[PDB]
Amino acid sequence: AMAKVLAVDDSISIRQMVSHTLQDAGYEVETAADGREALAKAQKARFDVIISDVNMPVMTGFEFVKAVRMQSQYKFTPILMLTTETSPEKKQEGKAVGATGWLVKPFNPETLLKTLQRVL
Ligand SMILES: [Ca+2]
Numbered sequence: 001a002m003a004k005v006l007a008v009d010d011s012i013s014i015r016q017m018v019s020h021t022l023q024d025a026g027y028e029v030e031t032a033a034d035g036r037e038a039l040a041k042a043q044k045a046r047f048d049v050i051i052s053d054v055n056m057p058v059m060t061g062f063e064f065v066k067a068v069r070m071q072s073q074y075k076f077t078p079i080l081m082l083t084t085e086t087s088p089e090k091k092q093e094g095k096a097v098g099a100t101g102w103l104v105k106p107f108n109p110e111t112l113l114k115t116l117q118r119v120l
Contacts, residue, residue: 002028003120004046008038008064009053009082014105018051021109027116035059035067042068047077049120051103054083054090066097078119 005027007018015031022029030045032038034056042050050068052061059067061081068074081094084105091102103115 002026003048005029005049005051005116006038006042006045006047007031007051008033008035008056008061009051010034010056011053014053014082018112021112022116025109025113035061035064038064039067039071042071042074046073049116050074050077050079051082051116052079053105054081062093062097062099065094065099069098080115080119 005022007015007029008031009015009018010033015033019029019031030041032041036059052064054061065079078100079098080101080103081099082103082105083090086102086104094102100119101115103112
């Protein structure tokens with residue numbers, strides 16, 4: 001009954017860090033290199049929380065969140081936006097798509113863990 005996390009970020013390093021930090025903590029973690037892969041993974045497995053980088057090469061975190069929120073099982077699933085630069089503006093966009101919270105890059109393991117707990 002481990003909480004399932006889907007972490008989306010094109011960065012291999014970020015994906016490894018999040019996956020490593022979270023799995024070591026005790027989460028079941030799947031990562032996706034992009035929004036399309038993330039959406040495919042989200043449709044076959046039931047994630048309890050989704051972490052999405054804001055700026056990715058193809059599908060942005062906002063469009064990914066907008067899309068995943070269309071999947072009925074993710075109508076209310078907590079979603080955390082990951083980014084190096086939050087802005088009053090980005091946070092508004094995050095509200096129009098349904099984002100739940102924000103995580104600032106770079107994060108140390110501790111902050112990542114406490115942030116997930118607040119939405120879970
Ligand atoms: Ca990125």
